[PDB]
Design a protein around this ligand. Structure first.
Ligand SMILES: [Cl-]
Ligand SMILES: [Cl-]
Ligand SMILES: [Cl-]
Ligand SMILES: [Cl-]
Ligand SMILES: [Cl-]
Lengths: 311, 311, 311, 311, 311
């Protein structure tokens, strides 16, 4: 069960290929996704070569135990992949054609800074560690790389499954390692975003601005504070549908700015009343009348600035 | 062992049959369902044939290790199915009758656009990959296909377990694959829907409309904003019982429209008061009196339109 | 090994018996419960008979491999039971006495229509499939059926562990199946129900009725709407302790009726004010005075009707 | 292998000892705790005795397969313990010294009646079933019983790991069973209890009592009802940190009483206003002035009574 | 196989080294983290030595079964690590160079007292138990200790992976144990902290202080109580992002103090009104005017004190 010796002083290329059968369970929080696929490997072990005339067979089938197979692993997997050998076939030249069906919870990092308009690149990193007797490098057989059309990620759009053909060969713990990058590109499709999240949140915010057409401090306090409780309650409602990140996101910025417009509104309401009370009613009414065009315009600009900064 | 050699240039039919023992744990979010069933396969391996006179037995029982068994897999499963061989029986001609009891978390997509009146078609896809020496196709033995009467999905109605008899044989990674479609049809039975979700939500909304029989801006602000907080609180309460989807659903549309009727009501309340204040009390009262019939009628039409658009 | 041949044309009775060691983890939502128990089986395999004089032994102990054992399974289990053979003992006549300790997540349906006064019957169904050479039927050895006194289900009262002695023998996929019904009876013991759920919910409701001793529309709107938000908030608080079902439950009906009494109260408040406003103050006060006895009495009757309808 | 024969008509004592390596994951809801430990057993199998002169060795090491080992199990475990044999050592007399490292989710019942001042006794029950040929009893070797000092349960204080030396030998399914009680004593250490739970809850309650220094029914209704919503909201906030039990707990009683003080306060507010309105202002003010000392004193007594009843 | 005999009366040093491949899934609540890594061990077994001239090979590769390997375990792991041997290489002197890839859920305690500015030290404890025939001690080969640069913990900053070179050799259950401390240092990086948690919480608090520029008791009660409900609602919103601990944390203290400033504000509001009412309007206005500078300054000091006490 030794590796195949070299003809000359060359490494062994193992011709890889992942075919996605069923991609599912993307955990935006944990930055994981479970995948169920085919892994196809191919190398040349001349020890296993045969004359198809004497053998009377075109292709000899082997058990994993019977022949030498390279130790292929995944870099960013949670635990060991649940792989099951489908077929091992040796052509007369000694070309081994290996196939296995596996399933693994992959760990690719996610970027929600542009949420819900963010797009991702999910990584599946294939490694192989060079042995003492001979060095091993990974190749990409593009014919054996693809994805099933049924493969779905609800709320996403599966764009492309490609692979960086060039391996990232490097040194590790005194041995050569050959790494390959398999990239799954998914772009978000949150259709019900503006009616589920933005629209009711803008309604609750606009309700507060009716305090610029009112003069009752008691009515204005109710308007601005009560809508503020409504805003918070609504955020607890859409808490589920929102990115729980240590960094500021696009949607997250909008929401923040909204809490600020509640604060500024309160200040107005308080000032209008203080001026009214301090017998400066002309200034009081001037402000409430200005706020009527000021608050909507400033909101619109600040939101245009935001969108520009994130995109 | 090796596969059984052909009489002629025909393929080997493996006569499949799934009998649902206990279907359970449907995760509307993950679009999964766990199933516990019997898988029955049958093929003819003439190598295993015998004279029942000399053997002194009518049917010989075998261990999976002892004889060749086809590599049958599921396409849309999360991990490998937890199968346990029940019985392997060979008749004197070499007809193998295999039976196993398995359990697997299946991944069929779900459609909640018509919630809570939606119905589903759960798929269980059976494959087999053709070997180098001989090609393999799947057949459906309808006698060995059914479901237990006890099989329950709480809140659903299990209608039919059928299978597309015709296999979808296709090319994959340079080998013949034979696919079978087993379909489980379930139609929703949400009995407590109108009293758990719709009725209290309509009450909270009607309470707001009492502001059309009021003239106190301070009472109307309390009525329309406070019921709005009640609406949001109620949604957090029924949050559990509602479809968390990236697309707009039926119930989801109703709810949206309700947040809009809160916004429109506030506008009314604000306008009635502004006219009252601007010494146009006739216009103010005309509106509040109109809103009295306007809001209920428009709600009813818009809800009739909705139902028609979704069904 | 082969099954034991019949003396005559009789089936083989396997004398079953489940002894519950530790019953736990009942998931009211999933309708599951995990159980840890002993399964005792006994049959007569005359091939294994011996003369205790020559053998010099009263009982011979065997390994599962060494002797024939019937394929016993559970019908309503999630996955395969984690069983471990305790002891296999053969008496001189050939009577095999098998014992194993297992653990399985059982799937019995639950009925919460009468919550929190509901009682359940948890089912553990034992099957055995008849072989080609001989048919097999299950018997109940009542001596080997019981439960440990320590066995607890927090919030329940474990009443009785009994079994329908008569097996439900039936045809399946062309073979005889012998089914047994093991029934675990548990009756709910929700002691802190009236102070955790009912009492604070009645207080929040009574607070609203103080609007019948008030004449301030502005105070009444606060009373009826604010307590309504308090009711909803309280429901979110007891959300945990309540049955999440597709059907209407007892507690669920009470709660519904309460949302209706909020609606009716609002109507009153609105009417009293409209009459007061429309210079019909005599009618206005007549209603508020009537509501004072009307609301409590109607509540009491409607609640008496409810209890009668559910019990 | 067979069990060791007796010298005389005596049973075999298996000298047990559990050493807690890492105790963790206590699920107050499920009444479970996961433990990682050493199990040390010792018995005398004279068949394995040797003369250390001829053998030239002091202690012979054996594989579990090679020698007879007693079937030791846990009573209250969820599934079978994940045990791994560390060492098996036989002294010249035939004294087997077995050691294994295991991990199991134990199921001990919990008592939260005195929460957050409750203390628990976690049980680990060791059994062994007597064989047909000889009976087996369990002994405690106190030298081999202890716990690591690092062993932590966050929010608890691990007091003592002791064992009831005397086994509870009993009859089960016609065989002798020998049970041992290993007790882990943990006393609660909820430090941030009064500032996380009690203090903000008393503040929200006191705010309501400011209604005794007010005469505005409209202000009092806001005070007593709004603080009531604040109380409910706060309970939803500390919902996580509170015992979800079918029985009444200490903290649970305090909370209940608080909902009652809200009810009584509302009654006051309503009565004071009704008397004021019914031109009995002297009685109205007498009550509000009394409530000022009445509510705090009654709260303090009722809370003293409570604490006395639970402790 | 047996362990390697000593040259003299010296123990066997096993030269350890952990290289972190992918560190992930840190459960702040459970105080656990899952890690996927390489474990490299090396010792000298002279029985395995060879002359590379006669063997004609530089390094001989072995199967775990073929040669003796030390029983290395982890102390603070939940269950047994999912290890898979990568390579076993023996140099001519008998130096075994072992490598395995493992994955384990580690259990290190966490300190959130300084949250969200807290830093942690995650522990991975390696043990080996001395055998009867020879004692074993662990050494650290610093060359074989490191971490991949891709290794991420979202919201944290992975600072250093080091190891206490000196083993903590001790007596346990009458045998020598050799323990090693591998330390992973992570410092928190909560970027969106002040806008996600602090800023909206300060806004809700400031809104309450506008009651010092108001004289309407009815407006002040709404201001202070309503913002109090907003505070509680906001805490339920950031409940997810906050440390659930039995001890007081930094952020936890800030929040507490905020509930106290709500209480103090209510007292003010109530006092100002009582003095106004008791015909002492000069004192009433003096207080409200003082509170205007008093509340902000006292808040700032108390927060400066806090920060100093925690840091
Ligand atoms: Cl892997
Ligand atoms: Cl499968
Ligand atoms: Cl089973
Ligand atoms: Cl066990
Ligand atoms: Cl370990």
């Amino acid at each position: 069960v030794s590796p195949p010796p070299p003809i000359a002083d060359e490494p062994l290329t193992v011709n890889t290929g992942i075919y996605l059968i069923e991609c599912y369970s993307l955990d935006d929080k944990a930055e994981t996704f479970k995948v169920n696929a085919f892994l196809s490997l191919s190398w040349k072990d001349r020890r296993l070569a045969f004359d198809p005339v004497r053998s009377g067979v075109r292709v000899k089938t082997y058990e994993p135990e019977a022949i030498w197979i390279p130790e292929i692993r995944f870099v960013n997997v949670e635990n060991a992949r649940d792989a099951d050998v489908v077929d091992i076939s040796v052509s007369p030249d000694g070309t081994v054609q290996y196939l296995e069906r596996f399933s693994a919870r992959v760990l690719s990092p996610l970027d929600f800074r542009r949420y819900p308009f963010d797009s991702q690149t999910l990584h599946i990193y294939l490694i192989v560690r060079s042995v003492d007797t001979r060095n091993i490098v990974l190749a990409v057989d593009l014919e054996k790389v693809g994805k099933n059309d049924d493969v779905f990620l609800t709320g996403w759009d599966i764009e492309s499954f490609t692979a960086v053909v060039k391996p990232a060969n490097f040194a590790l713990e005194d041995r050569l390692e050959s790494k390959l990058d398999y990239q799954l590109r998914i772009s978000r499709m949150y259709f019900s975003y503006i009616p589920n999240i933005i629209l009711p949140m803008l309604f609750i915010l606009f309700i507060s601005w009716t305090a610029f057409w009112s003069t009752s401090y008691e009515a204005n306090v109710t308007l601005v504070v009560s809508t503020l409780i409504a805003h918070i309650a609504f955020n607890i409602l859409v808490e589920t549908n929102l990115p729980k990140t240590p960094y500021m996101t696009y949607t997250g910025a909008i929401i923040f700015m909204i809490y600020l417009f509640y604060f500024v509104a309160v200040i107005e309401v308080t000032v209008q009343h203080y001026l009214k009370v301090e017998s400066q009613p002309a200034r009081a009414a001037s402000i409430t009348r200005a706020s009527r065009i000021a608050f909507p315009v400033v909101f619109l600009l600040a939101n245009i600035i935001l969108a520009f900064l994130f995109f």
